[PDB]
Amino acid sequence: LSCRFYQHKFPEVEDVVMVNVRSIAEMGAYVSLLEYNNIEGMILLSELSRRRIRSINKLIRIGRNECVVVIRVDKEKGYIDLSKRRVSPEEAIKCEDKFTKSKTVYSILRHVAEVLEYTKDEQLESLFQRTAWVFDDKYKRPGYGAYDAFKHAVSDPSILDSLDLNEDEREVLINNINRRLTPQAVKIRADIEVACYGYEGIDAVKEALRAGLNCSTENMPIKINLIAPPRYVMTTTTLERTEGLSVLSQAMAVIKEKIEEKRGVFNVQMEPKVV
């Protein structure tokens, strides 16, 4: 039970596709196009590298996935010429991210069709054309548009209500999207050693703790706990950890400023790191 990843059965010219090498011949390397329902392609022996290559098996690695640019395509003859020489590392990283997002969308729709028990490949292809390829044709972006629409539907399900597949198929697709692409959970923990060996030591410590807890933003409460007498643990359980680490660093800087204003030391035992 399989299908292609996009609405086209064949890739365009100069389009970088993700393949896996299946066999080695004298004319080149027979590969399978993983995002086009495992159609057979060929990476040429002249296009495997920019350097004189003694053997095809020195850089083939049959069983390894690689990004190759299409040089020649023939829909009538069934000939697909691929090339590893033309692709750049930036284009390879772009093709890897695009193939990862398209494989995630393929796994989500495969789980949705397994929940719907659609054993026929034509009904599964109609679910593909009604869920992902419509958004890919509307946004004019194969792979990016369907994944962006699914990431928007995981937050706001009004985009999934426009699909007219079925009454239960849309709910199963929304449940699969919310179970697969909505893992918004992180915990940015940090340790800070704030104290004050002065007159009002515990009072300044409680004031610095209240000033650090007051700087906690919405949906990101910086919870302070007494892990030790001289050390404290400032945890933060929230999504968007790139912003959560910055919020924890800002709270630690505010606590250090409040400790230094009341003549007290404030050391950073641990920086903002995810748990």
């Binding site: 590298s49 920019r50 350097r51 003694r54 053997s55 098996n57 020195k58 850089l59 083939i60 690695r61 750049s88 590392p89």
Partner: protein, 318 residues
Amino acid sequence: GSELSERIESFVETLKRGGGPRSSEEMARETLGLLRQIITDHRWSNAGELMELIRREGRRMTAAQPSETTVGNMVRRVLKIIREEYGRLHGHYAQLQSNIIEAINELLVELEGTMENIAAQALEHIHSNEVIMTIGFSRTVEAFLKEAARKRKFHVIVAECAPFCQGHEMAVNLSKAGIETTVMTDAAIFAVMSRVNKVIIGTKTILANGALRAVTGTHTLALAAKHHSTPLIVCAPMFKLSPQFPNEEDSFHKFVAPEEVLPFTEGDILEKVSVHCPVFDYVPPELITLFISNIGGNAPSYIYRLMSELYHPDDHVL
């Protein structure tokens, strides 16, 4: 800047203290990663400045561990890649850097598939009901034997090493595949050489004249194989091939602590005794019959051409 210098210092200290990492393939991959991290975060106008920078860093990398020549000839291969790119772009700042980056990328693709190519060409060197002799422990000859035993039935005599028995783990890893592994000591080599059909071993460093340094006790094994006229096979990848001549530079063998040979609980005789433990041994090219690498089989009278395909004679001093 800071990250580069601390990674370089940690690499130098890890090569200075012990074997970090264990396998030589991960050491070659982290050497490629260190070299690419150096060249993407530096500034140069001419290729000779990058050549002198890589030379100055490689001098420290060979001064850290002179026995580990994998980083040295890998730095030399990267230097010849720089020389070939400057030659093909001279007859150049971002395009040259992208060419060096993709050359290092395809070199890493070549380096990842050495063992699978050696295991793929292992079938044309092993026949059924064969007596195999192997000294030491290396994953290359282990993958060689465990792929040749998928369709053939033969016997491997894994000889242990006398300073530290590294052949025992290889023997219990080969016996899980069922190749009828025979384990013995180092003193029985000639005492088994009248029945050994072919000797298949690995090495640590392939020298420039076809000679090789390897684990100790294999010069005796190669002498016994020359005495009994059995062919010798070296399953070695293409990053253990070095242009360092044997009698040219000093510090050839790596001498380690004598506690593995003579323990500290021996008594009062440890003061009036001189215990040496050379972990490496030198094998001349006349005792070698065939080298096996990922590009195929080669004579010991051909390794110079591989030098002419991988190293420049101006980079031999580093």
